[PDB]
Structure formats: C-alpha cells, structure tokens
Amino acid sequence: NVTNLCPFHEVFNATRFASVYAWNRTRISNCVADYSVLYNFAPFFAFKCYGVSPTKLNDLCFTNVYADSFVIKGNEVSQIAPGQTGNIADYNYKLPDDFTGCVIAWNSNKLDSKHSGNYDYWYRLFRKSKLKPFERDISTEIYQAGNKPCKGKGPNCYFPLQSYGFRPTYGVGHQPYRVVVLSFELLHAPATVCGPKK
Amino acid sequence: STIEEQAKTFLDKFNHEAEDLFYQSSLASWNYNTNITEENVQNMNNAGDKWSAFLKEQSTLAQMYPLQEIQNLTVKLQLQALQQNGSSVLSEDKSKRLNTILNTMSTIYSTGKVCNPDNPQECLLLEPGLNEIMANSLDYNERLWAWESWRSEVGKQLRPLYEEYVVLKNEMARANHYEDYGDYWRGDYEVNGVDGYDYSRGQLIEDVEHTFEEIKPLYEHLHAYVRAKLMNAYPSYISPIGCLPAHLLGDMWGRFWTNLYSLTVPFGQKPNIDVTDAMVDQAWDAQRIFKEAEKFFVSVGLPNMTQGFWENSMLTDPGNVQKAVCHPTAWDLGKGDFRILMCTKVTMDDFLTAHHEMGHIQYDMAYAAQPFLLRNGANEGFHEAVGEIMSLSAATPKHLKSIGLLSPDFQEDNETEINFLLKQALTIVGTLPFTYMLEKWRWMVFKGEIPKDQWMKKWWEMKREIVGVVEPVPHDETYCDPASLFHVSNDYSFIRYYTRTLYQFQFQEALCQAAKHEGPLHKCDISNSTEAGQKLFNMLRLGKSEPWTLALENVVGAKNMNVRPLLNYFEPLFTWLKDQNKNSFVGWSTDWSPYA
Ligand SMILES: *[C@@H]1O[C@H](CO)[C@@H](O[C@@H]2O[C@H](CO)[C@@H](O[C@@H]3O[C@H](CO[C@H]4O[C@H](CO)[C@@H](O)[C@H](O)[C@@H]4O)[C@@H](O)[C@H](O[C@H]4O[C@H](CO)[C@@H](O)[C@H](O)[C@@H]4O)[C@@H]3O)[C@H](O)[C@H]2NC(C)=O)[C@H](O)[C@H]1NC(C)=O
Ligand SMILES: *[C@@H]1O[C@H](CO)[C@@H](O[C@@H]2O[C@H](CO)[C@@H](O[C@@H]3O[C@H](CO)[C@@H](O)[C@H](O)[C@@H]3O)[C@H](O)[C@H]2NC(C)=O)[C@H](O)[C@H]1NC(C)=O
Ligand SMILES: *[C@@H]1O[C@H](CO)[C@@H](O[C@@H]2O[C@H](CO)[C@@H](O)[C@H](O)[C@H]2NC(C)=O)[C@H](O)[C@H]1NC(C)=O
Ligand SMILES: *[C@@H]1O[C@H](CO)[C@@H](O)[C@H](O)[C@H]1NC(C)=O
Ligand SMILES: *[C@@H]1O[C@H](CO)[C@@H](O)[C@H](O)[C@H]1NC(C)=O
Ligand SMILES: *[C@@H]1O[C@H](CO)[C@@H](O)[C@H](O)[C@H]1NC(C)=O
Ligand SMILES: *[C@@H]1O[C@H](CO)[C@@H](O)[C@H](O)[C@H]1NC(C)=O
Ligand SMILES: *[C@@H]1O[C@H](CO)[C@@H](O)[C@H](O)[C@H]1NC(C)=O
DSSP, rough: OOOOOOOHHHSSSSSSSOOOOGGGEEEEOOOOOOOSSSSSOOSSEEEHHHHHHHSSSOOOOSSOEEEEEEEEEEEEGGGSSSOOOSSSHTTTTOOOTOOOOOEEEEEETTTTTOOOOBOEEEEEEOOOSSTOOOOOOOOOEEESSSSSSOOOTTEEESSSSSEOOTTTTTOOSSOOOOEEEEEEEOOOSOOSSSSOOO | OOOHHHHHHHHHHHHHHHHHHHHHHHHHHHHHHOOOOOOHEEEHHHHHHHHHHHHHHHHHHHHTOSSSSOOOOSSHHHHHHHHHEEEEOOOOHEEEEHHHHHHHHHHHHHHHHEEOSSTTTEEEEIIIIIIIHHHHHHHHHHHHHHHHHHHHHHHHHHHHHHHHHHHHHHHHHHHHTTHHHHHHHGGOOBBBOOOOBOOOHHHHHHHHHHHHHHHHHHHHHHHHHHHHHHHOOOOOOOOOSSSEEESSSSSSSSSSSSGTTSSSSOSSSOOOOOOOHHHHHHTTOHHHHHHHHHHHHTTTTOOOOEEEEEEHBBOOOOOOOOOOOOOOOEESSSOOEEEOOOOOSHHHHHHHHHHHHHHHHHHHHHHHHGGGGOOOOSSSSHHHHHHHHHHHTSHHHHHHHHHHOOOEEEEEEEEHHHHHHHHHHHGGGHHHOOOOOOOOHHHHHHHHHSOSSSSHHHHHHHIIIIIOOOOOSSOOOOOOOOGGSSHTTTTOSSHHHHHHHHHHHHHHHHHHHTTOOOOOSSSHHHHHHHHHHHHHHHHHTTTTTOHHHHHHHHHHSSOOOOOHHHHHHHHHHHHHHHHHHHHSSOOOOOOOOOOO
C-alpha cells in the first residue's frame, strides 16, 4: 500500500484564506496523512478534539477527510463548537451536535491586517432563519425588516453582508484568526486515509 | 414586525458602523496630538467632518420610530441618545453664525495676550508668564496690574459675543422642548420611567442648596483662618472684619487655594512627606512608576494593562523637534485599544497623577461590553470621582512606607496630620463656593431673571454674598469677568466638579467600611483588600445601562447625595480650627471695599 503524502501543507500556509460566509472545502483521500506537518505553526489558540485524542491520532486510519477554512475575529472563536449559539454559529457556519474531529485556530495578525484597514473579509449579519448543520448560503438579497415590500437599499432595508476592519493596532479579541476544521469518520471502507506507518 | 424589532436591527447596523468611524476619528486625533504638524490637522479635520456627518444622517433616520411604542427600556435610551445628541434644529444661517461666534470666542481666548506698559515691545502670554506671576509673586502692585490688565483686555472684547451667544443658545434650547439652556444642561441628571428612582430636573437645584447650606460653617471657619494669616502677611490692605480682595488668592481667578500653603502652614518646622529625593536616590523612572501603579491596581483584584498599552503609549516627552502637548490625558480609541499620553518627570505629583490616569483607564476598561451608545459613566460626575479616589488612597503614609519610598523611622504626631488635612482642605473645600456661585449666576443669566444691564452688578453682589471676596477695582457694564474663564468661554458645564467632590468621599467611606478598617478616615488604605475591588467593579461594569441612583444605592446604600462623609473626613481639622478661632471674629461684612 505504498502511496504519496497528503496535501496538508497546502490547506495551511496560504496567502488568501477565504471569508467565513463562503468557507472553502477540500477533500483529502488516497494518501498518507502524516500529522507532524502541523505543530510547525504558532502556538494554537485552540486545539479541541472531539471524537479522538490529539496524541492518539498518528497510528489511526480513516475513510475520508474534509478540511474547512475561514477567517473570524478573536472573541468569536469560542462559537465554533457542537451546540453553540451566536451570530457566527447559526448564520455563517453551524456544526452538528455529534461532530467527530478537531478544531485548530491560531493568531494571524501579522498577515491579515493593514494600516488603512482590510475590507476583503465579510460575514453575513441578517437572515430569515437559522442554518442546518454543514450548510452554506452564498446569496445577496436585500433584507426586509419591515412590512412594505423592499425594492432597494434604503429605510428598513439593509445589505445582508458586512466586512471587518482589521488593523495592526487592534487589541486582542479583535485581531484576525485563521480557523481550520477537520471532520473525520470511521465507517465501511477500505480505510484509504491511513497514518504514516511501516 | 413590530417597532421594537426594527429598532433593534437599526441599532445593530448603527453600532457596527459607528465603531469603525469612531476608531478612525480617534486615531486621527491622537496622531495630531502626538506629532503636531499641518497634514495631521487636515486628517483630523476630515475625520471629524466624516463622523459628524454620519451622526447627523443617523439621527435623521432614527427620528422615525416613535418612543411611546417601546417598552424594552434599553432600546429607548439609545434611541433617545441618537435623537438628542445629533439633531440640528436651527436654520443654516443661524447655525453658521453660532459656529463662527464659538470659533471667534475660542480664538480670542487662546491668542489673547498682554504687554508691559513700560515696554510696549515686550509682551507675554497668559499661560507661560501670567499664571506664574499670579502664583508665586508676592507684591500688591504687580498682581493688581496683571489682574486688571487681563480683565480689561479680555472681558471688554468678549462681552458682545456673549450677549449675542446667549440669545442663540436660548433659541436652540427652547426649540426642542426645554424652557431655556439651563434646563438643557440640567437634563443630564434626569431619570424617567423607573419606579422608586425617578429624578426631576428641578431636584438638582434644591439638592445643591441643601448641601451648600450644610457645608457653609466649615468653609467660613477656614476663610476666617486664612484671612487672619493674610492679615499677618499683608499689613496695609486686609481688614479684620472685611473680605479678601480677589487678586490675592494664588491664581488668576481664585478657583483653587493651593498656592497659599507655603504662607499659611500650621507648623513650619515640621517637614512634609515629599519623597522626590528618595525616588532620585533609588534611580527610578516613568516605567517604574507606572509598574508600581499597575501592581497597586492588581493588588485589589482588578486586571492590569494589556500589551498594547505598553507598546503604543508614550510616557516621556520626546523633546527635540517632535512637538507635543504635555497635558495628561487618558485615551479610549475603542476596539480594545487604550493609551495614556503624558510627559512624566520624577516627582510625587507625577506618582499621584499616574495613579489617577490608571484609575481612569480602569474605568474605561470596565464597561467595554455594553452597546456603543452606553459606554459612558452613569453621569458626568462618576468618572472624575472614580479617578480621584485612587489618588486619595495612594497618598497615605502607610502606602509609601509599604512601597519603600518613606523610611520606617517616620512618626505621625498631631502636627503632621493637621498639616496634611489643611493642605487637602485648601484645595478641596476652597473651590466649592466658587463653583456653586458661578453655576448659579450662569443659571440666572440663561433663565432671564438678570437683565443685560445688571450682569456685573449681580455677579459681584453674589460674589460678596457667597464667596466673601471683594473686587479691588470697580467694574461697570463694559466688563465681562465670567468670560475670562476657559470653561465659561468655551461652552462647558461646571457642576460636575461640585458633584464629584461629594461622590468621591461617599465612595471612599463606603470602600473603607467594606475593608474593616478602624481609626480616622483620612488614614485609610485598600491596597491588599479584595472585597473593595470586587464591590467597585460591580458598579464599574454597569456603564449607562442603569440610572445613577441605582448604582449609588448599590455602592453606598443612599439614593441621593449626602455630605456626611465629607464632614467626617475633616473632623479633626474642624475641631482644631474651632479651638484656634477663639479670638478673631468669624464671618464677613459686604459693606467694606478696598477702594474706600
Ligand atoms: C453627546 O455629545 C456631547 C457633546 O457633543 C458629548 O459630551 C462630551 O463628553 C466628553 C467625554 O464624556 C467630554 O470630554 C471631557 O472634556 C473635559 C474638558 O476638557 C477640555 O479642556 C481641556 C483643557 O483643560 C482640553 O485638553 C480638552 O481637550 C477639552 O478641550 C475634559 O477635562 C475631560 O477629561 C476628563 O476625563 C479624561 C478621561 O475621559 C481624563 O483623562 C481627564 O484628566 C479628565 O479627568 C473629558 O475629556 C466633553 O467635554 C463633552 N462635551 C461637552 C460639550 O461637554 C457626549 O460624549 C456625547 N454622547 C455620546 C456621543 O454618547
Ligand atoms: C431588551 O432588549 C435587549 C436586547 O435584545 C434584551 O437583551 C438580550 O437578552 C438576551 C437574553 O435575555 C440575550 O441573549 C443572550 O445571547 C447570548 C449570545 O450572545 C447567549 O449566550 C445568552 O445565553 C443569551 O441567550 C441578548 O444577547 C440580549 N441582547 C443584547 C443586545 O445583548 C433584553 O432582554 C430586553 N429586555 C426586555 C425587558 O425586553
Ligand atoms: C499587600 O501585600 C503585599 C504582599 O505581602 C505586601 O508586600 C509586602 O510588604 C511588606 C511591608 O513591610 C514587605 O516587608 C514585604 O517584603 C512585601 N512583600 C513583597 C513580596 O513585596 C504589601 O505591603 C501589602 N500592601 C500594603 C499596603 O501593606
Ligand atoms: C509556507 O510558508 C513559508 C513562510 O514564509 C513560505 O515561504 C512558503 O512559500 C509557504 N509555502 C507555500 C506557500 O507553499
Ligand atoms: C479553496 O480550495 C481549493 C482546493 O483546490 C483551492 O484551489 C482554492 O485556491 C481555495 N480557495 C482559496 C481562496 O484559496
Ligand atoms: C510625524 O509627521 C511627519 C510629517 O509627515 C512624518 O514624516 C513623521 O514620520 C511623523 N512621525 C514622527 C515620529 O516624526
Ligand atoms: C499582571 O501582569 C502580569 C505580567 O507582568 C501577569 O502575569 C498577571 O497575570 C497580570 N494580572 C492578572 C490579574 O492577570
Ligand atoms: C496629639 O494626639 C494625642 C493622642 O492621644 C493626644 O494625647 C495629644 O493631646 C494631642 N496633642 C495635641 C497638641 O493635640
């Protein structure tokens, strides 16, 4: 079962990292998934694992791996967990209550902030209802917070999205953070994605 | 959807835009104040214009949702703040006239100067030379000349501008709902909609009258003592039963009596507790002072400064070509950014000032979780009192002994305590009548009781009747003495000091009672105590989400202002003064005048 190495170093270590409301999704399969490629980044703000243990991870083998990446604030990172409420949790990215995987977040103030302000990262603010688990909604229609039918941006009509203003002089809890979520599962399969072993 | 949901959505959008706009404006202002040039002024002006315009349009949109269909009692406060603090009612021509008048008055006050009559080519500004001359010089003629020259060269110009200004302000205030501008100022203390905590705009006047009536005797005893000492000083101008002439109070106006300590010390032989020499010997600096203040604040349970505070704030004057303003201020730029700007030397006064500014920064840090429109003190007096209590607690001999600046071979007899209490009194008690009289005069002027031809007459009559101070030179209606003050000429309220003076002492007595301390109140420290810190934080974190009466009841247990703590603070000094004044007459008569 000699194979090549997985592209972990590519989902991490990227220039553009995608906004939260349009989070990326990469499938990992048919390779050797060495987990020593990470830990080479900054001291993580959070390394919570749910289905397995971080140490009991090198020797284990999976079926398929999904990686999701986006950028959020500092005080919103606590909302990425099974069964949590808040703006980001129910309007941008919702996790199932039986999640089996790990969540990695590390500060990236030195790469995602500018003196004049960075307006290339957005996040949805208004929506009609909640979000189903592992769902995405990328659309732009004027919100109707009123009785009169909405036509355009004006009174009681709002543009759904909004951008951050990341600056290097912001305090902790407002600086950008890079978040990567891995979702493993063990089921009926030839166990394609196995850890490095001989 | 009902009104409340739309109001909540609008509030969310407004907060999320106003945070960024306010941050940009504050950053521009700081960049100007640290690196004074011209392009910084341009950027600051642009940011201010953007912020003002945005507030104007947001108020115009916010004027749509009615206030009588909302029962949440927290949306209502923010909506009222938007509707009241950004609305423009007067026509464009009147607004331009008012702005031009304000700018002209500010420029006249700032650029005003006087020249020596002997040498017209020689001129000196107010702040560098006039303040120093009024402070340290001891000679009747020069002080009288400086006082008269400044009054005649400022008030005469500023009188017509004030006369035109009062009418426009009265029209603007009467436009919305208020009777006049005095009601507009007094509306800050109003509380509505809460049962058992209501406060009307007319209650403040009665409360101030009651507190001053309860304060008067101590002030008159101190006045008699100071008059006797000044008689011992000046032998041909002061009268035994007269009043103190205005040009012998240690400063330009008489707001503070601090500069009379070197002349009226109860016991000259006993030295003070100045610790400048020890700080010089131990090789200290600004960093050490600020670290000590941080440690003191940590010792009571409050959190300490962030890394951005040490990274961004400047604590020493760069000098050289980097011009800057050395007035100590505490900045709150938002988005978790806090800085302090000051030029720190090695002096005990700088120690106390650093403690005061760190207290202000802690107050700003405490409530940084409420909505954008509620991140402010309960009223205009809480913030100053919270700042001042730290300086009160950080000057005790016990704290200095624990720190190490004061030698352990120091003893506290009668005379040291008497001197300390007198020095505190000369600055605290000596300013209350001045503030009360000034605010009362402005209130009558705005209300219209005093006509335009009796301004100076009523001003000096009330000065004699309340402050017990008589002018050295008669003034006709061509003079405008109140305009010579910065606050009066720059459109600022003045009762906040009167409120903070009582608030700080109530807070200090409550905190010392919570720490289980015995002995005189003037010797109290809360450095190690953690109950006091938590109790203070419980009020600090509130912000503006509750009426100030509720916070006051939570802290001290009293709904209204009380003067008992202030009297209890000065009790030994009061007894000593009562024992000392058994010979000289107590009181004053207004019939006397220095000019025959
Ligand atoms: C609604 O709109 C009003 C007016 O538009 C706003 O009211 C202002 O509120 C701020 C803060 O609450 C007031 O700022 C205070 O000004 C005092 C006056 O200082 C002047 O003079 C000094 C020189 O002596 C100058 O250096 C200075 O720049 C001013 O020109 C200051 O003394 C106060 O400082 C105190 O607190 C700071 C910390 O906050 C300490 O560091 C200081 O040492 C000191 O203790 C303070 O800065 C301002 O005066 C108010 N305006 C008016 C006209 O009264 C409301 O904020 C606004 N409400 C909103 C938007 O919700
Ligand atoms: C008046 O309106 C305000 C504004 O909506 C109401 O405050 C709101 O109170 C709810 C709970 O009662 C808060 O929900 C909380 O959300 C957090 C997540 O952020 C969650 O962890 C908590 O468990 C809780 O569910 C809501 O945040 C809060 N609003 C704001 C802006 O903070 C208030 O209750 C209303 N009062 C009356 C009498 O109607
Ligand atoms: C608060 O507690 C600290 C911790 O004990 C005190 O610091 C000590 O103060 C004594 C005073 O004589 C010194 O002998 C010790 O060396 C100090 N310890 C340390 C670790 O510095 C502090 O004095 C207390 N606060 C007050 C006001 O006394
Ligand atoms: C990984 O990060 C380093 C850090 O500078 C960078 O030089 C390198 O190009 C990155 N690898 C990529 C982008 O494939
Ligand atoms: C999202 O992932 C895909 C995976 O191939 C990658 O090609 C793409 O560049 C990623 N998006 C961004 C914005 O980097
Ligand atoms: C101050 O402003 C000048 C003018 O633009 C600028 O060159 C300089 O970098 C700024 N900062 C300092 C510390 O001088
Ligand atoms: C105060 O700052 C020190 C760093 O010098 C830190 O270790 C400590 O935790 C801070 N205090 C609190 C209460 O966090
Ligand atoms: C000083 O205080 C002590 C404390 O008991 C007292 O006995 C003494 O009489 C006081 N002296 C004066 C001059 O007040």
